[PDB]
């Protein structure tokens, strides 16, 4: 086509979605990770995770307001990944890399799994 | 912080949100523009438009499944802007620039209004 493109549009959209998340505006699901609860937008979770995409396209699960993750999932690893979904920034540290990679594999977040594998390979 | 950032994340999120829109997945509102209807995600509309942000943060309007726009709004101008919201691409043409600018002013989409004003100033 003969379209023009606004370079910063996608980043500005995501920044605004994160602002809605921070103020708990139009969040439509709670993700339960052991004793912790994380409120989010189903659409953002689906856009970032192969697991959430599969969950919310299921005709029964699409209507659930609460999703319980596998008990092996670490709440901090999930929190770091939820922040990444809404910001593009990943808080990857020596102390959390194993939990983050395990959570990203479960959530089916391929680019996160890839950088974790590379950071682990560099430290061996 | 000591975060790393995935450059393409915001663009990939928006691409996936547009894929959900195309398949009518988790769309939660109909925007009525005269005889036409446009299905969308409230969160994406709020992230792109000062008007939708104000509408869906209102305690009564946040719960509406149908929003009727002012009858002066052109359905094609709205369609072009809805596509821009989900893609960052604006189909701006000599034949539609006036309707697009008028719709972007009503929707409170400042960057779109700015490029329309510049394209109009160049042709005078």
């Amino acid at each position: 086509d003969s379209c023009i493109q606004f370079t910063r549009h996608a980043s500005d959209v995501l920044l605004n979605l994160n602002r809605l998340r921070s103020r708990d505006i139009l969040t439509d699901v709670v993700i339960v990770v052991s004793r912790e609860q994380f409120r989010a937008h189903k659409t953002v979770l689906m856009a970032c995770s192969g697991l959430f995409y599969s969950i919310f396209t299921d005709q029964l699960k699409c209507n659930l307001s609460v999703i319980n993750l596998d008990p092996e999932i670490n709440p901090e690893g999930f929190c770091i990944l939820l922040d990444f979904m809404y910001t593009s920034r990943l808080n990857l540290r020596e102390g959390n890399i194993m939990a983050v990679m395990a959570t990203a594999m479960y959530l089916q977040m391929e680019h996160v799994v890839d950088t974790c594998r590379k950071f682990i390979k560099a430290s061996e | 912080d000591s975060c790393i950032q995935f450059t393409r994340h915001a663009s990939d999120v928006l691409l996936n949100l547009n894929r959900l829109r195309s398949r009518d997945i988790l769309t939660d509102v109909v925007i009525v523009v005269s005889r036409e209807q446009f299905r969308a995600h409230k969160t994406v509309l709020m992230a792109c438009s000062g008007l939708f942000y104000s509408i869906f943060t209102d305690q009564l309007k946040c719960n509406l499944s149908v929003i009727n726009l002012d009858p002066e709004i052109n359905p094609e101008g709205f369609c072009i802007l809805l596509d821009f919201m989900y893609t960052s691409r604006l189909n701006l043409r000599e034949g539609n620039i006036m309707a697009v600018m008028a719709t972007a002013m009503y929707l409170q989409m400042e960057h779109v209004v700015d490029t329309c004003r510049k394209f109009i100033k160049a042709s005078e």
């Binding site: 379209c3 493109q5 606004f6 | 604006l90």
Partner: peptide, 4 residues
């Protein structure tokens, strides 16, 4: 704005 750019030509994509």
């Amino acid at each position: 704005w750019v030509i994509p």
